[PDB]
Amino acid sequence: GWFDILDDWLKRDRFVFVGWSGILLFPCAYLALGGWLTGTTFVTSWYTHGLASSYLEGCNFLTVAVSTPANSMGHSLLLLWGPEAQGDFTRWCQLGGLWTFIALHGAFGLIGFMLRQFEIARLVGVRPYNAIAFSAPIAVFVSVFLIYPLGQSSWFFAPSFGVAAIFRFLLFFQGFHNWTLNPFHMMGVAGVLGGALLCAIHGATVENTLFQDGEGASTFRAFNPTQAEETYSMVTANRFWSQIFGIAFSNKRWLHFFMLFVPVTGLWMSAIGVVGLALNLRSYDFISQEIRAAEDPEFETFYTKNLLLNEGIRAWMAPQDQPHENFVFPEEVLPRGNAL
Amino acid sequence: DGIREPVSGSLLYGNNIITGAVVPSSNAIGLHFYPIWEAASLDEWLYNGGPYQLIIFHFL
Amino acid sequence: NFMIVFQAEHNILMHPFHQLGVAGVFGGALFCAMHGSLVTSSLIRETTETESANYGYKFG
Amino acid sequence: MEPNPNRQPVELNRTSLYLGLLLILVLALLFSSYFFN
Amino acid sequence: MEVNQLGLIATALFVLVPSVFLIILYVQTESQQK
């Protein structure tokens, strides 16, 4: 009646589509972006960590963030109307209400886009591989921004939206979990560099086996969008690659599926890796190495250097990185290379 | 580090795959060309991180 | 070990060029994934639902 | 038994055999370091 | 130092049973026809 009217007004063709997914996607995405943009502009983090992170306080674009809540909030969501600000907007901004605001509204914007991709694919009449492929960034998002702080004691250890605050996350993860020495991260890095490797090489091969159909040196003008005749010699690409490297694709369908497969799996394996850290289960040691370095003090490996360096990262970043513990270390118990 | 602290990077002297490495040339050797025949013995060519230079020049 | 000493002595993360390098790798990986999905989702019907889709291409 | 027309063979080939062996082997080499600890 | 002899068995089975699984799958379909 009115339902099929609401249907065909939404599912209609326009300069940019909306659909049923539009109803969830657009408010959530727009609020999350808008929140980050006002947070980086006016909002302090001086009542939480003792930082300044906004243009109003005098910070540049490389040092701003919408910073996390305080440690004493636990895992509270900090709702505007709730009994931690009691209907008050100023305190709600100071206590970090914008971080959770942005995080939840962005979490629903991701589901909106995911659904939007499904809907447009069902409409156009193609297979939905692009929506299955898009579950890797949502896996990463909910493993790093949601599951990891929910395994810890607060939102305080989650990464803050900002570039330098993510850099501090990199150093924190390296320092306290030795994150590069965990095999799931090895697999994620490999998967991602292999995605990057396939990108350059596939482009370079297709663009350097093109047929003559133009008049000018540029061959960008020899293309019509129809698929009636082939646009690059696949046979030649195979013959080339089987001879310079040893193995080659001889199946386009499989080549493009390999391109889908490598980085999405990489990110999935890394998502399993960071949920493993949320319980503080962390690959940090090989027991055989400790017992050996215990019985022989003139044994050295690069791994032992890395653990001494991890000591340096932790002991020197802990004071201003965990102010809620009110840590005070004397200057004589800080670790030093020259004291060894 | 040219002050008599060796580093083990070989599997047979108690490393696994993750910790193993070919350990760079010595700080005492510098930017010098250091093949097998510019050393007094193979023993001390290996002691100064000899194979490191030998892999990388050919590889590049 | 190399990365960690490199970061300490020069702070490579605040160098704008390293930031373009990670953008290129993240974007390269990203364009690979979406290129793969868009092409494999547009394939023609020469198959059935008991034999893989990849036997629609007969070579060359 | 009684014939069932729904039953069908499985098809595995030489290239997929190589890919599978390579994946199991590089996985083996990566995780032995942690299993031995 | 230490080697863990249950870790030995752990890799040994990990690399055997799927290689054996794959080698049987590949051999029975190539031993049949056209």
Partner: peptide
């Protein structure tokens, strides 16, 4: 004990390269 397991796996991987290159399934145009 540990070194043998490692090198056996590396040896299997390079033998696989040889077999995969010189005893492949020949891709042929139709």
């Amino acid at each position: 004990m540990e070194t043998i397991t490692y090198v056996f796996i590396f040896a299997c991987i390079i033998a696989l390269f040889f077999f995969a290159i010189f005893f492949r399934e020949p891709p042929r145009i139709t």
